[PDB]
Design a protein around this ligand. Sequence first.
Ligand code: V4L
Lengths: 237, 300
Amino acid sequence: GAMNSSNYAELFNNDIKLFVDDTNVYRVTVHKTFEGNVATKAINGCIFTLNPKTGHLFLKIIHTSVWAGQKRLSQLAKWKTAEEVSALVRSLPKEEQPKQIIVTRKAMLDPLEVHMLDFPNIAIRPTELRLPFSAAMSIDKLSDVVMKATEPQMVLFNIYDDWLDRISSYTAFSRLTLLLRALKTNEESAKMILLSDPTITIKSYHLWPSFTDEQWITIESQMRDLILTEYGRKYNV
Amino acid sequence: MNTVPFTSAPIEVTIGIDQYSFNVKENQPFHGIKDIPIGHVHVIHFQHADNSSMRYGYWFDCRMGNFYIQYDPKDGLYKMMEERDGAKFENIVHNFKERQMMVSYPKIDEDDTWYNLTEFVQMDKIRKIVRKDENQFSYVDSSMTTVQENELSDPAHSLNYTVINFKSREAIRPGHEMEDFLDKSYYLNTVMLQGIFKNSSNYFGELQFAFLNAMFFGNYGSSLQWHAMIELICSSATVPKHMLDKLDEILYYQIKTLPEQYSDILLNERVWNICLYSSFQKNSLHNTEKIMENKYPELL
Ligand SMILES: Cc1ccc(C(C)(C)CN(C)CC(N)=O)cc1
């Protein structure tokens, strides 16, 4: 059924599963026309498809050309997402295909179920979690490759960098969701925290800085403080 | 005008014939129903006084044989049977009519209700949905499940309605996933009408039979079938104009005939609001929309 606080450890068992987030597939800027009307200009987007156990991220870049001449773009975006996820699954060897796909927004369920009719044994699930994957475009190198794309392009990363060498996938996912929640609530502060100490660098193929275990605890502490503070500045407590 | 005699009425029972009903006391002399209009299917149905559980009944067409009802005290129900001896049958009927122990099918002359509810319903199609080939009439009851219901347990006793499933490979062409899910015209016109039903008359016949089994027996899977066949049409952008006009008439009379106090259970909020207000055909069901609004404005 739906994924929630109660069945959270299932994410880290040995059944292959993917989270799919479509929040950054169809992206626009809204602007005024010369006549004083409002129009949108699309910008490149991405599907965020993540194995939470391994950290493998399948980042399908959605180039603005896929919207040309199309109507009802927000609805098409859900079907385009579903088409691309279905294509990804079919491209994987059978032993690599997921047993479950968890969508972060319930409106993806019917589009994905229809595109996956050929895979009756893959369960399509919603979640009750309010996961912060929309903030993936606050990760500088992910945002960079999406904005630079001139054609449709599948891009990869281990969103956990090398963390699994030292921590479990439960702990890696918790760190990730805390980082992303922070970036979503106050990107400027969050990025200030992550980069304040010039001596800690980001390896060329890593998305995050090379913190020691001790430095990660300090970092994670600062990210919590931010999330509670912003919640302070928002609600006045 | 044809007749279905009853050997006796040994247990208290509400007897229905089409949209009519007669309430009978234990061993009260209800010996038959006479003056049944020829040219239509009919349904005789029963609800025992002592156990309103299980409405059940028989679909039949008097052109196909001489039929009668006889209570079976072992199986505990009124059973339809065929009398093959024509002289025995006419003699039985004439005696019962002389004692005036047969009620007259109480059709008002102006009244086309039954015709309008059974316009496309044929016995031959009924007998393929209800498989029991040794009989010319078809038994249905409240509890019988449909083929599609059994997929999600006794096959011989199933309602073999045409399986409609909007998230199935039959419904969705590879490469037209979004197109076919949001506009079911391919599924309606090519898969179902051209492929399976052959024409819209057979489609409407099954839709009307599903409704009638839902209404007369509270058969839940029949109600699901009726709503699914409505939804398939309303969710299709391209429907022949004659089918839409006829659908509006069909549904109008079904909504007109529905008991007011059974609307809560027999009408699916989501299908009706979608068909009347959101779907492609939102503007094509004027009669049905007007009666729905004036009779069930709560559902909407
Ligand atoms: C429930 C119900 C039960 C019985 C009937 C009769 C037709 C027999 C009633 N006859 C008029 C009596 C008679 N002596 O002929 C009608 C309706």
